[PDB]
């Protein structure tokens, strides 16, 4: 049960128990997993009198490339348990690359647990610094409308979807947050761009009680407020006449909004009367809801260049920093949210995993062995190592973080990085230049509509005979199908090489399926990435999917605003 | 050459077959007519008259877990079912007893009963599979880094997942895929791929045992 | 210091106490009010909520037979309950299983129920005590040349024999003497001579159970 004092006391003790609890976490992981095949080749059996010593001395370090085959063995047809154990109910993807190739990472119900508990503690602490009213709400531009079923009839999943459409999510977060503005069906709407045309509109639906504005990233709020900033005369028109815009086309969300709507005209006088009075939006977040205690999101790392505009958007309202963890590993929680974003540090909750840190202290990098969590030295930057419920045992994520201080017996970390970058040559290309170029060439047909492309990805589908690629696009607005079909065609029309030619001209590989994506999914990608447990080097988004890419994959199938097979060819 | 007195649809006997095949032992199969139980069967087990029965060096082993364990202890050189420490074997035993009793009685209600015990049986079976799913935390197998003792204990019910999926009208996969999936990992080895007969035979037979009595 | 979660009339708890005391461990005993199952008990086994529970290294060990083999594996240098061979071990496990099934149930019927249920229970226990008599044959014990595993498993039921005799209004000794006889032989071990409560009190507990459910 989510309360204030008893839990923060338990967390305090938890961060004091740090060595014991982290140890117990390791013991919990191996006791729950003495059966892993990789562990057999490592020489494990549980117990032992030199367990920590034997684990740190006998099980080797692994990369994305080497963890790819096993979880891959887990996901496709062979619903076989391997690295962790149980064929996880959902699989996750990793930023940066695995030799340009995808990376699979298991997701467990224990992870949902990690989420509930971390959100539980952090929310209690922020409520300690920025208390909120229990009868109000919060503007959450949070999304998880997409759900995909992998090549074996097994779901693969992002942290977001695996959390929101999770069975205990509604039961789990009822006490830890301020009630959601949008109906779940609108959140889970098959069209996230218009869907949360409806998000601005829903959070905006209950402004006076919206206790805070939420997106996990500064940039999340930034494009959410550039997109908040992308619908006014229309939102007003839609809500005014009681009739939503022609922009909206999905039957479930249309049913929802129409269900909500009735024609009201004076309020119009109001929205404009306030809005542009300021010198073009300083203090915009307070302007839209005057009483939101804060703007909560990831403010360090890659969001460092987005915090200013957001700040420049949030005005005088304080900007509060976010905790760190993911579908791959959970590390730190911020329990002192009142700290501004630049100085911000986050303490690590111990039972979320078993972490180790490789020093960069020598030159670059330095041939030094991993040291304990509290064995790490203050002020130094280390490489994060993960041993958690997610299939990472003594695994190198590949990011850099600094120890600023200690919250009691558990150390404070800091992130100043960006990319986990040393790439290698791929096989989901179709040169990245070729892919980016495909998007560019096909997108102008959309640019005819006064728009710019914001993001993209792709996926190789060998379920089908013949196999067929599926290209994904994130764009600014809603348009007709004809242009999209033409876009798919051009996507095929820009894969400039002869190989593609031989293939689809023949059809040993089927026509591209263009499942155009709604706004914010790739944003969900960056968002599920910089917060992953390691360091701020988590932003190189893999452009095309080999069966082993999952987070954008969970973010692949359901929200097909439209999905088409080339009518040409 | 060791003798096995067993039943082709019996899960427990199947545990024995999975063990003897899993290690590397040539062994002979004997089918037992419960109506006309063999003389060696009457002599080996005159009390329970149960299976599987493994006559080795002239002395028989009765009960499934007993035959399997007997196998692990007799030839402990290659693929050990147990972990090195007492507590690991302990987990294997606690969970094995879980598999053979509450789990087995619940499934028994599912395939062999009508009315109330079938529904209650459905509930018991589902909660049981999720608790077993939970304890496993995330283990590819059960007892150790590879094929386990309790692995042997529950794998034979994977030949019965179909009958429960049809009789219980539940999908033990969509509600707990990881367990059935655990079973299809184990199916890739030839021990279960050759010890346990076809699933359809078991669902049909179970339907026939239902046909025979009310 | 090993912590035992025990119940005074628990033949099973007695299986644990007899096991540990037989080997050579100094332990502490905690009496349970199952009305109020202990916080560590509800943490040891949160679903079964059953004893005996032996706590070692902060690890709860559950189930009676499980607990005694746990005893064997915990201090394997002095007093083993098993012989060296796998087959002998299999025999011991087999007969222990014998002790747990029809026998325990049979006694449960003889002292816990009456009438139509009762005589069935009485013929079943006389049958069981008889097969028991036959397999005992000559051995001072059961599970080995000395004090054994299953000796631990079945010696503890000998304090309930008084109850079986009175409610049963029987005499299990005339039909099968060597068993109870063997029991008082085994009573000389300090393991059972200090772990098992008085039989009059046990008879009285049976009296309470009976007076409550008539
Ligand atoms: N605990 C035993 C139970 C064995 C058992 O009852 N087996 C059935 C065959 S599936 C049997 O022997 N039935 C005797 C009969 O039908 O009379 C085990 O796990 O093997
Ligand atoms: N098969 C069990 C039998 C244990 C047993 O009967 N325990 C009883 C002691 S009377 C118990 O703990 N009952 C708990 C309750 O029903 O409250 C074992 O040997 O561990
Ligand atoms: C326990 C938090 C799980 C939810 C995770 C996401 C949110 O909704 C807040 C950011 C967080 C991303 C992160 O902690 O890395
Ligand atoms: C777990 C979810 C609430 C958020 C997660 N960071 C994601 O974007 O996938
Ligand atoms: Mg997100």
Swiss-Prot record, chain A:
Localization, UniProt: Cytoplasm
GO process terms (BP): cellular response to auxin stimulus; induced systemic resistance, jasmonic acid mediated signaling pathway; protein adenylylation; regulation of response to red or far red light; response to mycotoxin; response to UV-B
Sites where the protein binds an L-alpha-amino acid: 160-164, 524-528
GO cellular component annotations of the record: cytoplasm
Activity regulation statement: Activated by GSTU20/FIP1.
Recorded catalytic activity of this chain's protein: a jasmonate + an L-alpha-amino acid + ATP = a jasmonyl-L-amino acid + AMP + diphosphate + H(+); (+)-7-isojasmonate + L-isoleucine + ATP = L-isoleucine-(+)-7-isojasmonate + AMP + diphosphate + H(+)
Binding site for ATP: 92, 112, 115, 157, 162, 325-330, 551
Binding annotation for jasmonate: 95, 322-325
Induction comment from the UniProt entry of this chain: Rapidly induced by auxin. Accumulates locally in response to wounding.
Mutant phenotype after disruption: Long hypocotyl phenotype under continuous far red (cFR) light. Suppression of COP1 disruption. Decreased sensitivity to jasmonic acid (JA) and methyl-jasmonate (MeJA) inhibition of root elongation, but increased sensitivity to abscisic acid during seed germination. Reduced induced systemic resistance (ISR) mediated by P.fluorescens (CHAOr and WCS417r) and P.putida LSW17S in roots toward H.parasitica and P.syringae pv. tomato in leaves. Increased susceptibility to the fungi P.irregulare, U.vignae and U.appendiculatus. Enhanced sensitivity to ozone O(3).
Recorded GO MF terms: amino acid binding; ATP binding; enzyme binding; jasmonoyl-L-amino acid ligase activity; L-leucine binding
EC number: 6.3.2.52
Entry keywords, A to Z: ATP-binding, Coiled coil, Cytoplasm, Immunity, Innate immunity, Jasmonic acid signaling pathway, Ligase, Nucleotide-binding, Plant defense
InterPro entries xrefs: GH3 (IPR004993), GH3_C (IPR055378), GH3_M (IPR055377)
Coiled coil spans: 4-24
Subunit annotation: Interacts with GSTU20/FIP1 under continuous far red (cFR) light; this binding increases its activity and determines the priority of substrate binding.
Family: Belongs to the IAA-amido conjugating enzyme family.
Function: Catalyzes the synthesis of jasmonates-amino acid conjugates by adenylation; can use Ile and, in vitro at least, Val, Leu and Phe as conjugating amino acids on jasmonic acid (JA) and 9,10-dihydro-JA substrates, and to a lower extent, on 3-oxo-2-(2Z-pentenyl)-cyclopentane-1-butyric acid (OPC-4) and 12-hydroxy-JA (12-OH-JA). Can synthesize adenosine 5-tetraphosphate in vitro.
Name of this chain's protein: Jasmonoyl--L-amino acid synthetase JAR1
Protein's organism: Arabidopsis thaliana (Mouse-ear cress)
Gene name for this UniProt entry: JAR1
UniProtKB/Swiss-Prot annotation, chains B, C:
Gene Ontology CC, one term: cytosol
Listed GO biological process terms: glutathione metabolic process; regulation of response to red or far red light; response to gravity; toxin catabolic process
Protein name (Swiss-Prot/TrEMBL): Glutathione S-transferase U20
Keyword Cell cycle found: no
Cited Pfam families: GST_C_2 (PF13410), GST_N (PF02798)
Top-level enzyme category: transferase
Induction behaviour: Induced by a gravistimulation.
Molecular function as annotated in GO: enzyme binding; glutathione binding; glutathione transferase activity
Gene3D superfamilies assigned to the protein according to its UniProt record, in alphabetical order: 1.20.1050.10, Glutaredoxin (3.40.30.10)
Keywords: Cytoplasm, Detoxification, Growth regulation, Nucleus, Transferase
Record flagged with keyword Transferase: yes
Protein's cellular compartments: Nucleus; Cytoplasm, Cytosol
Disulfide bonds: none
Subunit structure: Homodimerization. Interacts with JAR1/FIN219 under continuous far red (cFR) light to stimulate JAR1/FIN219 activity and substrate selectivity.
Lineage: Eukaryota, Viridiplantae, Streptophyta, Embryophyta, Tracheophyta
Inactivation phenotype: Hyposensitive hypocotyl phenotype under continuous far red (cFR) light and a delayed flowering phenotype under long-day conditions.
Record EC number: 2.5.1.18
UniProt cross-references to InterPro entries, sorted A to Z: Glutathione-S-Trfase_C-like, Glutathione-S-Trfase_C_sf, Glutathione_S-Trfase, Glutathione_S-Trfase_N, GST_C_Tau, Omega/Tau-like, Thioredoxin-like_sf
Family named by the database record: Belongs to the GST superfamily. Tau family.
Stored PROSITE patterns: GST_CTER (PS50405), GST_NTER (PS50404)
Gene expressing this chain: GSTU20
Catalysed conversion reaction: RX + glutathione = an S-substituted glutathione + a halide anion + H(+)
């Amino acid at each position: 049960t989510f309360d204030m004092n008893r839990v923060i006391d338990e967390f305090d003790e938890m961060t004091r128990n740090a060595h014991q609890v982290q140890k117990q976490t390791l013991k919990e992981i191996l006791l729950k997993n003495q059966s892993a095949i990789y562990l057999q080749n490592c020489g494990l059996n549980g117990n032992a009198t030199d367990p920590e010593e034997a684990f740190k001395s006998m099980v080797p370090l692994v990369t994305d490339v080497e963890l790819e085959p096993y979880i891959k063995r887990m996901v496709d047809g062979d619903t076989s348990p391997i690295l962790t154990g149980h064929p996880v109910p959902a699989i996750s993807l990793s930023s940066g690359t695995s030799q340009g190739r995808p990376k699979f990472i298991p997701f467990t119900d224990e992870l949902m647990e990690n989420t509930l508990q971390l959100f539980r503690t952090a929310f209690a602490f922020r409520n300690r610094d920025f208390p909120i009213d229990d009868n109000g709400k919060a503007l959450q531009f949070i999304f998880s409308s997409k759900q995909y079923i992998s090549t074996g009839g097994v779901p693969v999943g992002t942290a977001t979807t695996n959390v929101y459409r999770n069975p205990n999510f509604k039961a789990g977060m009822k006490s830890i947050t301020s009630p959601s503005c949008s109906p779940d069906e609108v959140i889970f709407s098959p069209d996230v761009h218009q869907a949360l045309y409806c998000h601005l509109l829903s959070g905006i639906l209950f402004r006076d009680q919206v206790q805070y504005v939420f997106a996990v990233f500064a940039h999340g709020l930034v494009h959410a407020f550039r997109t908040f900033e992308q619908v006014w005369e229309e939102i007003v028109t839609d809500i005014k006449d009681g009739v939503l815009s022609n922009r909206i086309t999905v039957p479930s969300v249309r049913t929802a909004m129409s269900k909500l709507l009735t024609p009201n005209p004076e309020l119009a006088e109001t929205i404009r009367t306030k809005c542009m009075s300021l010198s073009n939006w300083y203090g915009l977040i307070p302007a839209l809801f005057p009483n939101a205690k804060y703007v909560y999101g990831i403010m360090t790392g890659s969001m460092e260049p987005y915090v200013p505009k957001l700040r420049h958007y949030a005005g005088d309202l304080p900007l509060v920093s976010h905790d760190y963890g993911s579908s791959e590993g959970w590390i730190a929680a911020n329990v002192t949210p009142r700290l501004s974003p630049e100085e911000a540090t986050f303490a690590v909750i111990p039972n979320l995993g078993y972490f180790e840190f490789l020093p960069v202290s020598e030159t670059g990098e330095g041939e030094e062995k991993p040291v304990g969590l509290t064995q790490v030295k203050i002020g130094e930057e280390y490489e994060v190592v993960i041993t958690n419920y997610a299939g990472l045992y003594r695994y190198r994520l590949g990011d850099v973080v600094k120890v600023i201080g200690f919250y009691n017996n558990t150390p404070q970390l800091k992130f100043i990085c960006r990319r986990n970058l040393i790439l290698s040559i791929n096989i989901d290309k179709n040169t990245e230049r070729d892919l980016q170029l495909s998007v560019e060439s096909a997108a102008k047909r959309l640019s005819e509509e006064k728009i710019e492309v914001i993001d993209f990805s792709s996926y190789i589908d060998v379920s089908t005979d013949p196999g067929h690629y599926a290209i994904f696009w994130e764009i600014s607005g809603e348009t007709n199908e004809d242009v999209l079909q033409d876009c798919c065609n051009c996507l095929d029309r820009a894969f400039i090489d002869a190989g593609y030619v031989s293939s689809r001209k023949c059809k040993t590989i089927g026509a591209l399926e263009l499942r155009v994506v709604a706004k914010g999914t790739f944003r969900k990608i960056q968002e599920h990435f910089l917060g992953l447990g390691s360091s701020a080097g988590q932003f190189k988004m893999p452009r095309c999917v080999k069966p082993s890419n999952a987070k954008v994959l969970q973010i692949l199938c359901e929200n097909v605003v439209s999905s088409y097979f080339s009518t040409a060819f | 050459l060791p003798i096995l007195l067993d039943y082709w649809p019996s899960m427990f006997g199947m545990r024995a077959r999975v063990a003897l095949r899993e290690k590397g032992v040539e062994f002979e199969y004997r089918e037992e007519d419960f109506s006309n139980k063999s003389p060696l069967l009457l002599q080996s087990n005159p009390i329970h008259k149960k299976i599987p029965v493994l006559v080795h060096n002239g002395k028989p082993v009765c009960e499934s877990l007993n035959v399997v364990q007997y196998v692990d202890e007799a030839w402990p050189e290659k693929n050990p079912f147990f972990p090195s420490d007492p507590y690991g074997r302990a987990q294997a035993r606690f969970w094995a007893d879980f598999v053979d009793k509450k789990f087995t009685d619940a499934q028994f209600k599912v395939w062999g009963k009508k009315g109330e015990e079938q529904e209650a049986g459905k509930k018991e079976f589902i909660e049981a599979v999720k608790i077993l799913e939970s304890e496993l935390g995330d283990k590819p197998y059960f007892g150790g880094d590879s094929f386990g003792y309790v692995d042997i204990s529950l794998i034979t019910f994977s030949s019965w997942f179909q009958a429960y999926e049809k009789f219980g009208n539940f999908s033990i996969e969509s509600e707990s895929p990881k367990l059935i999936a655990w079973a299809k990992r184990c199916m890739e080895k030839e021990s279960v791929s050759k010890s346990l007969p076809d699933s359809e035979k078991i669902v049909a037979y179970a339907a026939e045992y239902r046909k025979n009595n009310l």
